[PDB]
Design an enzyme around this catalytic site. Structure first.
Site, PDB file in Angstrom:
ATOM      1  N   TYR B 109      19.165   0.399 -40.700  1.00 38.09           N
ATOM      2  CA  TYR B 109      20.227   0.277 -39.849  1.00 38.09           C
ATOM      3  C   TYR B 109      21.633   0.235 -40.489  1.00 38.09           C
ATOM      4  O   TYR B 109      21.879  -0.840 -41.249  1.00 38.09           O
ATOM      5  CB  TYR B 109      19.902  -1.032 -38.864  1.00 38.09           C
ATOM      6  CG  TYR B 109      21.118  -1.073 -37.812  1.00 38.09           C
ATOM      7  CD1 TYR B 109      20.897  -0.234 -36.916  1.00 38.09           C
ATOM      8  CD2 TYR B 109      22.080  -2.164 -37.705  1.00 38.09           C
ATOM      9  CE1 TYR B 109      21.821  -0.361 -35.578  1.00 38.09           C
ATOM     10  CE2 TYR B 109      22.757  -2.297 -36.722  1.00 38.09           C
ATOM     11  CZ  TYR B 109      22.830  -1.269 -35.683  1.00 38.09           C
ATOM     12  OH  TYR B 109      23.813  -1.486 -34.903  1.00 38.09           O
ATOM     13  N   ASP B 202      24.456   0.374 -48.361  1.00 42.86           N
ATOM     14  CA  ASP B 202      24.841  -0.539 -47.374  1.00 42.86           C
ATOM     15  C   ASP B 202      24.411  -1.887 -47.821  1.00 42.86           C
ATOM     16  O   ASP B 202      23.345  -2.297 -47.524  1.00 42.86           O
ATOM     17  CB  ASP B 202      24.117  -0.096 -46.081  1.00 42.86           C
ATOM     18  CG  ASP B 202      24.584  -0.875 -44.829  1.00 42.86           C
ATOM     19  OD1 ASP B 202      25.051  -1.960 -44.958  1.00 42.86           O
ATOM     20  OD2 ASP B 202      24.326  -0.502 -43.691  1.00 42.86           O
ATOM     21  N   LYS B 230      29.728  -9.273 -43.477  1.00 42.89           N
ATOM     22  CA  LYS B 230      28.903 -10.621 -43.286  1.00 42.89           C
ATOM     23  C   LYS B 230      29.350 -11.738 -44.166  1.00 42.89           C
ATOM     24  O   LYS B 230      30.109 -12.424 -43.983  1.00 42.89           O
ATOM     25  CB  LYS B 230      27.135 -10.212 -43.506  1.00 42.89           C
ATOM     26  CG  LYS B 230      26.696  -9.418 -42.383  1.00 42.89           C
ATOM     27  CD  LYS B 230      26.745  -9.785 -40.879  1.00 42.89           C
ATOM     28  CE  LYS B 230      26.376  -8.716 -40.026  1.00 42.89           C
ATOM     29  NZ  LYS B 230      24.850  -8.670 -40.009  1.00 42.89           N
TER      30      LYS B 230
HETATM   31  C1  LIG Z   1      22.474  -3.444 -42.986  1.00 36.91           C
HETATM   32  C2  LIG Z   1      23.445  -3.541 -42.109  1.00 36.91           C
HETATM   33  N1  LIG Z   1      24.412  -2.502 -42.005  1.00 36.91           N
HETATM   34  C3  LIG Z   1      25.448  -2.298 -40.935  1.00 36.91           C
HETATM   35  C4  LIG Z   1      25.374  -3.179 -39.989  1.00 36.91           C
HETATM   36  C5  LIG Z   1      26.570  -2.982 -39.077  1.00 36.91           C
HETATM   37  O1  LIG Z   1      27.600  -4.168 -38.967  1.00 36.91           O
HETATM   38  P1  LIG Z   1      28.483  -4.433 -37.519  1.00 36.91           P
HETATM   39  O2  LIG Z   1      27.554  -5.160 -36.751  1.00 36.91           O
HETATM   40  O3  LIG Z   1      29.361  -5.437 -38.185  1.00 36.91           O
HETATM   41  O4  LIG Z   1      28.865  -3.147 -37.015  1.00 36.91           O
HETATM   42  C6  LIG Z   1      24.597  -4.128 -39.873  1.00 36.91           C
HETATM   43  C7  LIG Z   1      24.611  -5.031 -38.677  1.00 36.91           C
HETATM   44  O5  LIG Z   1      23.937  -6.106 -38.785  1.00 36.91           O
HETATM   45  C8  LIG Z   1      23.427  -4.327 -40.884  1.00 36.91           C
HETATM   46  O6  LIG Z   1      22.609  -5.638 -40.679  1.00 36.91           O
END
Ligand SMILES: Cc1ncc(COP(=O)(O)O)c(C=O)c1O
Ligand SMILES: Cc1ncc(COP(=O)(O)O)c(C=O)c1O
Lengths: 389, 381
Positions: B109, B202, B230
């Site tokens: 994700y 990511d 985060k």
């Molecule tokens: C691995 C990962 N990448 C990207 C995102 C996207 O971040 P945001 O929710 O701050 O847009 C998340 C959100 O949980 C994530 O868990």
């Protein structure tokens, strides 16, 4: 002219030289009561002490929602988001999904954030009906379901609905254009948008990221008496804490960022909207600040026999030096403006202790901290600047 | 469960009930809720100007701390969310390479942006993750199964010349916690490097979590771009992407002063704790051992994957991907377990694929209490 901020409070910046500067930009819109607002920031700090983000339902959720519903007529249910861009994207996905259509109508110069389907080249743009991507590296079909018209052109807009009304999922619009000058809607224009969208089945989306809680308590919606199907909010709503929302009446809302709706954000909304709700004359007072600044700046420019264009809606206001030789859209406004000299003016004003953005199409955002004495000082600084130009 | 307040590893309900939280708001809280060091700094920035949209002294400090702690990061651009940082990273890759195709992995994700939002049939199916996306949203997006080197090699043999980027959660932490198979990240690095495609890690979850320099450091593989969020901002909304100078050739909230302050306070704190990840490892181990013992004692099969304080716990009816893991899990019973554990004063997400995120506030005594609560829950199952 390099300006690095050390701190800020009210309408003042302190740079790293400990210089002090009256700020007319005010961080691009959220600070209705100026920088370092204690009522708001005490509440947000308090929420940090009590848990700012659990990802779970919180008591604040229902309070922030209820204050938005109260102050904004056309909003009954809201979904929170972490930015305007996100709220726009979600609102537009809702409209596409709800209508079963794909086409979204935008206006030239109107800015709705950086998401893939709406990011157009605005000022960097050829014709108003050209859809030009606003960033490199977007997919080729990014804008293939996005159309564009000139702001305040009823004939083109009627033509588009006569041809394609059946295919339009939504029209999105800054009800007052505040990203390319401040250009209010022509008389009847918002009502025409409301009539055409209503008749076609298209959703009308007001992007009130700037206009919300700014041009009136209930935004442009309230000020112009036209209610959209969806409203996007941000900026003033959260007092400059990153938060945003979209919402609408229950009917429109029938049908995700992890920071979206976190507790400190909603606390900021509760404290900011609470503070506004408790000041029933606030917008009359903001109006008077706006008027006094507009009159002051006009007088100074007329006195130095420098032509200027100024549009104002409340404390939202664009100020643009004109070329030695009423615009209804960005093209008309830009054609009149002397951009290089306006940048030079900005440099000079900054040396005199007043900051506005160097691009004459970036508006000023006044606050209750821009008192009559602050404005009188701005006048002296601007006059000292113009004489130097 | 409606929250009233939170501190350390504890939630307080609107009934004034107290609940030990294993979810911890999905990842940012390495030191638990209401971390005063980080609070005090963010409040202080509110008192001194939280958003002017202008360059600030903090900008250079936050950038320098990230460049110090994250090996592969030298320049960085801030953003308001992970979604925005991903979108920008991917646009940078498309623009830099002159290519359009982006490779993703099933279950991974990367936020809600138009070109990556997939539904979390076959692993190679690219299904839109939200209604109302444009028809061509995912027309330049491809998907493979996680930890399948054969499919990955096939894709690069056929299309390597067209791939602008591969994006990847270096450890999958949104669909179980499924580390990369040994050699898998190295293969990705090699195939991308050979093809001219950018490799994008990511690390929104893994950054400053599985190691001080993230999965990059932990697995010894450096991407071309890194996304962070985060833990970086302590749960203040902020994110970033960056890379080496070569690779690096805005939401209005992006880079605001309170966000960068939170980054300075949080990354400053972590920089001062050189053994932090050893200590987090010991918390993780103690929880894993404890939970395993309780389940084995009730003769209930369970699947547990852990990387540091990132950990998935799933009641069963080594998986390398989501499909293999989901097939083994008893979802309804795990939901029932969650209900029971919540009544006992322990919260984890009811979906067994949503991981636990432990913190330095999950002490040995907290974990012993969790053990009692989980045992009293299992007996009730
Ligand atoms: C691995 C990962 N990448 C990207 C995102 C996207 O971040 P945001 O929710 O701050 O847009 C998340 C959100 O949980 C994530 O868990
Ligand atoms: C009218 C309007 N809509 C949307 C946005 C996007 O907001 P964000 O920068 O929070 O993504 C802006 C930003 O200034 C804006 O002025």
């Amino acid at each position: 002219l390099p300006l690095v901020v050390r701190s800020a409070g009210g309408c003042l910046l302190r740079d790293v030289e400990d210089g002090e500067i009256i700020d007319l930009n005010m961080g691009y819109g959220p600070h209705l009561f100026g920088y370092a607002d204690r009522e708001v920031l005490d509440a947000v700090a308090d929420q940090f002490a009590k848990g700012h983000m659990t990802g779970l339902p919180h008591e604040l959720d229902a309070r922030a929602g209820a204050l938005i519903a109260e102050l904004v007529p056309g909003v009954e249910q809201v979904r929170f988001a972490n930015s305007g861009t996100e709220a726009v994207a979600s609102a537009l996905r809702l409209a596409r999904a709800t209508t079963g259509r794909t086409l979204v109508v935008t206006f030239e110069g109107h800015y709705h954030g950086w998401s893939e389907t709406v990011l157009r080249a605005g000022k960097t743009a050829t014709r108003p009906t050209d859809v030009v991507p606003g960033a490199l590296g977007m997919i080729p079909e990014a804008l293939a379901h996005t159309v564009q018209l000139g702001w305040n052109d009823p004939d083109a807009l009627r033509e588009l609905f006569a041809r394609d009304g059946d295919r339009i999922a939504a029209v999105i619009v800054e009800p007052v254009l505040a990203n390319a000058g401040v250009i209010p809607p022509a008389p009847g224009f918002l009502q025409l948008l409301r009539e055409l969208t209503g008749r076609s089945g298209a959703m009308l989306v007001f992007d009130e990221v700037i206009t919300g809680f700014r041009v009136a308590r209930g935004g442009a919606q309230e000020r112009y008496g036209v209610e959209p199907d969806l409203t996007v909010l941000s900026k003033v709503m959260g007092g400059g804490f990153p938060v945003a929302a979209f919402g609408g009446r229950r009917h429109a809302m029938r049908m995700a960022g992890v920071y979206a709706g976190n507790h400190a954000a909603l606390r900021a909304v509760v404290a900011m909207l609470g503070k506004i709700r408790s000041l029933p004359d606030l917008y009359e007072r903001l109006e008077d600040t706006g008027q006094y600044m507009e009159d002051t700046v006009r007088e100074v420019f007329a006195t130095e026999k420098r032509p200027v264009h100024i549009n104002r809606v409340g404390t939202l206001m664009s100020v643009a030096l004109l070329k030695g030789s009423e615009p209804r859209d960005l093209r008309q406004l830009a054609a009149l403006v002397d951009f290089p000299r306006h940048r030079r003016l900005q440099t000079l004003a900054q040396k005199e202790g007043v900051y506005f953005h160097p691009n004459a199409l970036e508006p000023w955002f006044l606050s209750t901290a821009h008192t009559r004495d602050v404005i009188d000082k701005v006048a002296g600084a601007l006059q000292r600047s113009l004489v130097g130009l």
